[PDB]
């Protein structure tokens, strides 16, 4: 059996950038799914941590909490920075998407039909730094910290990704950003894995809004 | 080093990453912005993400609370002994700064109406801790390990924060109150605790706790 099991809802979400990263690296997983019948059963939901998914499994360590997932899969594989200069400046950005992905997350499922014209109009505000940082690192032509992906980029990457389908041509704006969105989803093995069923045939979100 | 904390003044999200300073005996300069100095827009204009806390270690400079908080956890090695365990931190405070944003909203955007169900909600909100330290040996030493990492600077502010907010909330749970009593007594944290550099701060920036 895989050593990696990540347990979740039917949908990309919050675990969108893990699996890219794992696919990317040549990791092998397993998906452990959770329907909302059975999560309304309350059982499970009772025995996680936080009441929440993503649960993760690696061998008998069980984690929650999807930057953990991340930050856990960037220490085990090499994907934070070089040093610990670089990895902060990981962290720094990797907080940063996910203080994005939180207002994203509130649009689609809290606020969407009243929210979208106004979160599109701030979203070239939003998405502005990550170009600012991309244009202060070898001009745009590598990763968004130093030399070496790292678990910040396949954040990153979704966030891009599930921006782009949310407001078409959002990244017009930014082309090194435009530039490192197809650079990366390039990459060999994430290439394959965005095309294959596992991640095709799966929502973005889990209330058929994107 | 060099250490320089950049922020409004107010506790609110440094006051995590100045008890480990003063926990860790270490020293920095607090450069407190005014509301003239923000409104002004210079200063935002330039933070990364145009928020504070901004922090400068020597030349280099960060944005984002708990990017100081693993910074510095990682720099001074409070981040657990080994890999299993710095995932089990990243754990613990990737839920504090669930409850925080939480608190967070409550404060600043809907206090006198949200009060009342946050309180509510809030046992059920405490009680992965308390679970957490009963499964650390026996929650007498810290929320991961045998040792102090950025996590539990964290979690001790949000624990001191929702005493403020409502009294007795750690009544029922025996592992965190000991645990805030045992951490708070820390020599050099005690001290900053009681000093008026920490009690003179506002909790948060609207005048609401
Ligand atoms: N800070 C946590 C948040 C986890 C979370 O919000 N999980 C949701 C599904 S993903 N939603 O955008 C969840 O488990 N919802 C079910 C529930 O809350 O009962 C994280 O894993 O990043
Ligand atoms: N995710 C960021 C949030 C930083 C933040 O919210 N900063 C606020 C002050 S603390 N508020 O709860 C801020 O800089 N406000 C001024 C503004 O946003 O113009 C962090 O440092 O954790
Ligand atoms: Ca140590």
Known sequence: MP?????????????????????????????????????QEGSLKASCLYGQLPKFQDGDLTLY??????????????????????????????????????????????????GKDDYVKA????????????????????????????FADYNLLDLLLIHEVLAPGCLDAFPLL???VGRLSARPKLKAFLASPEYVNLPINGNGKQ
């Open 3 to 39: 050593p990696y099991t990540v347990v979740y809802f039917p949908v990309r979400g919050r675990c969108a950038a893990l699996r890219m990263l794992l696919a990317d690296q040549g990791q092998s997983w397993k998906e452990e799914v959770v329907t909302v019948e059975t999560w």
């Open 123 to 150: 979203l070239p505000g939003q998405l502005k730094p990550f170009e600012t940082l991309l244009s202060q690192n070898q001009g745009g032509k590598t990763f968004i910290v130093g030399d070496q992906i790292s």
């Open 65 to 114: 909490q999807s930057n953990t997932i991340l930050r856990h899969l960037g220490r085990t594989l090499g994907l934070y920075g070089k040093d610990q200069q670089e990895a902060a400046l990981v962290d720094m950005v990797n907080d940063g998407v996910e203080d994005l992905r939180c207002k994203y997350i509130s649009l689609i499922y809290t606020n969407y039909e009243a």
């Open 178 to 180: 435009s530039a490192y």
